[model samples]
Target: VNWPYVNTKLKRDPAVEAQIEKLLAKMTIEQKVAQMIQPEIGYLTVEQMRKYGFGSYLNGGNTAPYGNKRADQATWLKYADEMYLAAMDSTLDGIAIPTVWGTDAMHGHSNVYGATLFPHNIGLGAARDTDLIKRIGQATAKEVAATGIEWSFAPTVAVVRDDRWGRTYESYSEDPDLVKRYAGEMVTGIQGDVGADFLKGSNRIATAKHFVGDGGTERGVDRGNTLIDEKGLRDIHSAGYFSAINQGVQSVMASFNSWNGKRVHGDKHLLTDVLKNQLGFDGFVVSDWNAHKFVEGCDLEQCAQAINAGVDVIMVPEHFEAFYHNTVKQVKAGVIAESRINDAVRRFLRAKIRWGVFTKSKPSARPESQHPQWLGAAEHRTLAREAVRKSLVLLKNNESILPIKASSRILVAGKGANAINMQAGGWSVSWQGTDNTNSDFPNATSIFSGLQSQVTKAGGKITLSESGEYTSKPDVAIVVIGEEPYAEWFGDIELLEFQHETKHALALLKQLKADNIPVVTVFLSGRPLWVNKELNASDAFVAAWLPGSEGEGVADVLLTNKQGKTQFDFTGKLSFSWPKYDDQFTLNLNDADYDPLFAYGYGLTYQDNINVPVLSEKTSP
Candidate 1:
């Protein structure tokens, strides 16, 4: 009676078929459209689902319930289960169909206060370790399941083309192959093996998201355009979905960006023709936050067209009543085929079945699965540190300023070197990062602390300064430069440097350079900044991408380079086209007329090393 009626030994399951047919006949078009509604529960009442027939519910952004009593994020799911259970129990004219709940629990149920926060996807891309990513997926699923939240909107398989895009850190890499590989792995982790726990084994229903080309948008800007021909779009943008489909990804989400001048939400060629049929992605397609607006005509017309175009679940959170009414009217008037409706319904049903929410049972009281391993486990932290080290590239090592000798007095300057917020960047515990010191992640260490520890251990000292006094002229100066804390909506960047973070750091470096101290420049950034003057100030420069929780690894490079043996090589090449000026934002990789200060894959290993040119000794400033 729950799902998938089978033929019996004596005869076909006529009785089950009869019930399904009867149920189908009794269901009205209004009721069916209502079934697809996925309103956020905290806003809308459960009575709406019972009264008007709401389809589904999802926690898109910041899903965890906000209250002093609801300390643990697990409580949100407990509340969710209760809310959905009530909706399931409520009979729509005696036919019982359960309402499902969903959330974007990706990257460790990110919004949850106590949940583990993995390194953002950009770092993961450099790691290129799919198995490790899979474990993170499993752990993320376990945490999500603890709250009885069965579905996860995750495995963000975006092949990021440009680092300037605000969400670049969310993608695995620009390489379609690597992105697809990780996507498949994450999907497998979310939807675990047959015996794996539905809510437990990283086995939640994995949604391969932001369908079509959200990554290759020009200039790496969020919701920007992908100005590519159909062939280019397919080759660059949608190419990664094939492996995901082959890996059994259960769902897909449409992107907010556009292909060429055309919005992707309404692009039938990419959505229905390429995604579902050509790629054989049988998974249900879900809309990004509110992407239905991009479809050709008005909101209602777009919604109807999107359904016909192949979107299964409409995340039409607002104007739901109108959306519901319009969808029903279309179905009833035969403007939309009954077969199309049946196909969509089947996909939705499959998702519910996969989630195991269809099974009737009293929910458990102990909502949280207290796995001590979920919270910044040593393994996860270690790997994140390794990723940080790998993503780092030594831009220039002019005068052997790096690998500052052990037991040497090191002066660490700038807010970034000592601040944890700069290290973690955006989307940490709280969006725009915590108040630096207020971070929940344990054992917070900055470049200052890291270098201080190294200096003290090597029988030296680290003096953190903001351009004040340094008696006896410090042996070497390490200036850490970067943008301040920012994330999401508030981070609508107008200029690369919001304040004098870059200018101040450079000024400090120049003063240090004048004092006969070799300045080793370290830049911590979400994307490359226009710091030509800063680059000129220091004898050596290193580009350290948001390295999470592992500042000591940087010391390893500094110390090793000083010891006359450089083990680490600059492996990170520009996945997107590097820009000379901040305003020239182009996402294309390997531009034919490319003219960058530091070309992609440009780095010097210590084996064939040359001495770093000092400002006074080599060229008088």
Candidate 2:
């Protein structure tokens, strides 16, 4: 019940205007530019906040939960409360602007365990139930706020044109209309009202992300070139933001993709003119992870250009001070307009006020329920499990292999079969996620553990083997392998292919094939990889794209099968284009008419007859 303030539009609010007049009178030119930026917490200190009058602070990915030094979720609430209180104590007129603490939270409050872990957008697209997606957003928001986090760069709103994109799971759907409808509601669920974006109408602010197109990138590459024409770009990608704009989303993150040849981060026409003017979106725009570096001009020059181009906040982890000084100098020198500085500051201030960062924010040095109901709570886990069940699209189930009779012996192979860390992927408690089998976060059970539990109860046995460890052939083999999770510059990659375990899984499959045992291949990956060889090798394939928390959901589909066929349908579709070849960075439905082996909605039902039923002799009658 520790609610903050109601939403207040800057252009419409008289009180905000009056407050801005006072703030403008007191702020130096440097201070004014500095106020527009809310730097990540690590770089700046309480002393810096007092000196520069920073507008906001970000609790970055893997940042200490409750502000812990080790970034552990156990103490996130207490530490975050401490940081906010300390920040408030350091503020210039005893008035601390609320720091909009942002985390990836791309698919649930990802960094915080006990928080809901929804199916990634790729899975959501296959389900195509906007209401379900919206409920996920709402559930995600509650969990996020429970941990003392208030802002999230989520409901990615990217129309995943190419399933080949590294972050395909982040977008809601491949279709823009689907992305638009669901993304907007997602914003509302987190941000609270139109003001809250997707959370409790007042609890946290939701960010409609990457503004234009990251999913439409060439070759499914991260931050690669976007070659679409203006109309195509607008129609295919930008179609989603209209819903976001209409819902009153508080923040819009600019994309790394280029329209024509220009980077969206520094493109004034799109970021400022089109988004701000035409769309009438008043929310401030922020750049994606140092994307300003890739802008057309020089780094600092482009920084100024981006700011002038209508970027409200600059997420310069390495250049916060430099950017602060440069923008101030630029504004005073008349190179950058004073009005532009005010415009940026205005949007930021208004957003803070709406979130109650300004007038009535409470700075708790120590939080009361460190593990709130939303953070890895049982209710959230049930919801997450449901999401996993609904999201799993049976890619291929031939010869009635799945819904394997609960009494059938099951042998699981590959590293991911029992690895909890890989199942969760990136942006867990740490940026790269825990590298061990058992994650420190709650509710993260390994896929093998889940299936084993289900099978053991029914008098069936489940055995897990790593690469090069199979004593004898079993009736069925579940080979699970996928990509390891990483983020930001660390995630940038040229080759997306099978690693050590996948090769091992293939070899095991070959061995199983020699024994004439049917094999079901489970691929656990963040995005689609060079899976052609893997796809062709197995009798059945399941695209378990980053299924978190509810490994039982996989078991649900597997155990429910009767004679290898289950009630589960191949409902999940590709959120981006399934690649035909590795030479291409990205591919989508728009790329080739029908080049993909399996179409976007391609899924195999559980109806491959492995056994024929015995018939009574009617001839005797």
Candidate 3:
């Protein structure tokens, strides 16, 4: 089966290949070992990068240069320039291979302060608009390039089979077709098409990540065992890779999860045979953070098995020294073949040469890097705002309660109304996105702020109460609430309940209903959770899945004009089905008995007035 996307064409020039071979011949065992090791910026230094001639370096979620987690863009550029120049200088060693810098810019260069944080992948999935996603990719590329990053670990093409997974927000949808559709668009948007400005200027190397079956782990556990057969893996989990590889995506990241209790990092059949050989992916494979250590009979210090299994670049963030020395020793001992080492080096250099990283000048010298104004630029924010407007899913709107009249007095309550971190979800300025305040997002607008300006300008009054306290009865109450910030294992839940033990938002909704004021619940969550009781308590409910930075977009659709016209109709549909019961963890659109509270692709427009019935608060399926 020769797919058209596969063997499309190789863009490598024969002269460049000859040059790469020449460079590879000059490289010694130590130099070759250093190229395979990728250390985190927080643990490694410019001097270290210069000393080892590391092939790549990355900043962890919480890592910032100069020991300042709150470092500005200029400070970031200073460090980028320093490290980049150090890698180019041949004085440290006879070999000088330009290093590539990578980041988890999963959504809009998110780790940087004041960067336009776009909605997470879950929200983007609901949009089902490829054009919007492509624009987002382009915008994200510009912002990332502004800081001198050469690579981004993004466009997570996981086909989520269970909502209980903490990383569900990272997945676009449960449907393989949707994931396949987004994969090519995102890759094209990030790297541009081959020969048509591919990896030129603002475009960076994009990675189709956590390859193969990350979304189908049993029990929805992070890094847990994926108990599926090979055929199921090919049809369901590996669907996105075909489109992404066809689009000429330059890199692949290994998943931490195992297939049938075997770590993916050590699985030669999938990583080498299937992904590299069967699929015809030309790019190199990179291991996830410290993922090589998890392989059977291997530790952080010595992971020859992983490299032998076909991991080209090892992301040994902290234990890089041990890895470097051990790899050199293993190669000499014949435990790992020299041919495998050459193959890995060749693959890595191919991407580096294709990306022009070797020939490109200093970080600050890049055209995109010089323009400091591109960071959080107005145009990018506007694009993100548009995405926010489109990603909002109107799950329940009764009696035309939404498109709230601008002239009506409204009360905004709950902790999420004024909180930027809550709206941005886990991967924001910091990892897990906790302990962040409104001050962290200087360029952002809060949901309450957006609503207040519109309501006050339209001859109305607004009040904000975190505990639902108001002096007088208002025409309606908009309670903004959802799950607190979490990422990875911290986010995995045994039950699919929203704020189960807290009951803060549910209590506030019931309190407002008792007062006879119409209540509109705006739920901010990473994935769909059982909210039947909360739905029973509110007159209207909206599934606003992590709309980052641009809260004004929420107000644009929820509020109408002074003349009582619809401002913006609801365009978002549920990419993930709303569960009918808490136990329905794996319920999908094509289930044998697919009886969900709201089906997949369900959303209510302002024109359609459907009253959702009061559902039972049962925990059973």
Per-candidate local distance difference test: 0.64, 0.67, 0.87
- RMSD (Cα, Å) of candidate 1? 6.5
Report the C-alpha lDDT of model 1 over 119-230, residue by residue, as the tens digit.
Answer: 5676566555777777777767766766556678887877766656677667766667667677767776777643334333335777877887777777656787887676
For residues 384-442, write the lDDT of model 3, one tens digit per residue.
99999999999999888998999999999988988989999988997898888999897
Name every residue pair that clashes in candidate 3: none
What lDDT tens digits, residue by residue, belong to model 2 across residues 1-621? 111122233234577667877877676676677666666666666666666656666766544543443434446655555556655654553444445567767778776544556666666676667767767777777677666676777777787665455576676667777777676677766665533232223357767887887777776577778888777777788767877767777889998877767888888988877888777888788777777888766384237788888898887755677777777777778888888888888887767775656654453321322445656667767776776766665655666667676657788887788877777776665666645347465566678887888777767777887652556657788888777766543555566445523466566667766777777888877666666666656777788887776777788776754344353544565554455555434445655555764556555555444332222211110
Q: Using TM-score, give the best candidate's number.
A: 3
Ranking by TM-score: 3, 2, 1
- Residue 411, model 1: Cα distance from true site in angstroms: 2.8
Best by lDDT: 3
> Model 2 scores what on Cα lDDT?
0.67
TM-score attained by model 3? 0.98
Q: Give per-residue lDDT, candidate 2, residue 566.
A: 54
